[PDB]
A paper describes a structure:
The polyamine-binding protein AmvR regulates the multidrug efflux pump AmvA, which is pivotal for transporting polyamines, an abundant and prevalent class of amino acid-derived metabolites. The AmvR protein can be further divided into two subdomains in each protomer: the N-terminal DNA-binding domain (DBD) and the C-terminal ligand-binding domain (LBD).
A single AmvR polypeptide chain is situated within the asymmetric unit of the crystal and forms a homodimer structure with its corresponding partner in another crystallographic lattice, which is consistent with the results of size-exclusion chromatography. Therefore, we speculated that AmvR may have different states in solution, including apo-state and ligand-bound state, but we only captured one state in the crystal.
Author numbering:
A (entry chain A), B (entry chain A): 8 to 192
The structure:
Amino acid sequence: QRREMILQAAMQIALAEGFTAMTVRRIATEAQTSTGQVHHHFSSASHLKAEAFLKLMEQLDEIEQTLQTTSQFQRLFILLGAENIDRLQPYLRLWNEAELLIEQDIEIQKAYNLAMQSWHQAIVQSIECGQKEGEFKNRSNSTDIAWRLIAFVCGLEGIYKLGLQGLAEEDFKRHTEAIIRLELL
Amino acid sequence: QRREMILQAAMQIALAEGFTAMTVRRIATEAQTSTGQVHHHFSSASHLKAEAFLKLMEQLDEIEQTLQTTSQFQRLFILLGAENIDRLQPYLRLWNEAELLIEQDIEIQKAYNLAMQSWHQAIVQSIECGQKEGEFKNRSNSTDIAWRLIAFVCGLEGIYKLGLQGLAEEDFKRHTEAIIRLELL
């Protein structure tokens, strides 16, 4: 589990300071091990960053599954980021940071796509559960709706980054609710 | 109109080769003028690039208004990029190129936002015309729907750029049609 303890040290630095601080020197110091042992367990510094990122993203999904919901409508708001739980703010800060690194880090590029597919599958699962429970309609198939919901929230957050003048960031929940309602009721 | 002829030369280089080729030396040669006259008429090389970009974007809207449509449903597909007119491919190539430059060019940053607002207002106008003509419903206000439609298509195209494995780019029209139908019928 000494490899796991190195990973846990990288995850702490990632959550608190981001990817650039995640040098092998720093991680070895934090895990109280040698840089030689970090290199033994991980093929590259970028492999370690991506593996810690994926662990933190799996951890984000775990945390999200402990918020109490009564409906799949509620769980969709959480999965789509419309509820801004304060616990998850450093997790989302890392996610946005990873999004910028996929254009210069091959391992982070692959890990980001794996996390995207995991996110899509968690939305599919919530949609299909809501349909099975009688809460959601099924005018379109669940895979199509999930990609459209992800596309919407990523696009809306992309437009917020522009700093446009007639667009209030505080409307994100209201817009996301409207789209969820139109797609599923 | 000698200033206008310099602008037209910059627009030709922009459409054919992109922003990096738009040096003052190159534009002066193409407009058959002196670099001194280019500097007289334009405050900076980046001012010239942004002014030519905005002219080409206004030109894209003009071209789009000449495609014959029978419904506002059809015009929305065109405005949202779902119909891939071959004429507009170099215009859209420049638009995506500008999107990358807003993080290092202050004038392109401002011009891109102006074009975004112009795009939003053209969608608002189409929505409100379709509602006035009896073709569209009005469950939400036209400004809200327009931002959501722009957010969707930008988000969908952003997800296409990732190179995910279970996502077919050829589905863009089908997804955009579904969202238009849900928002407006």
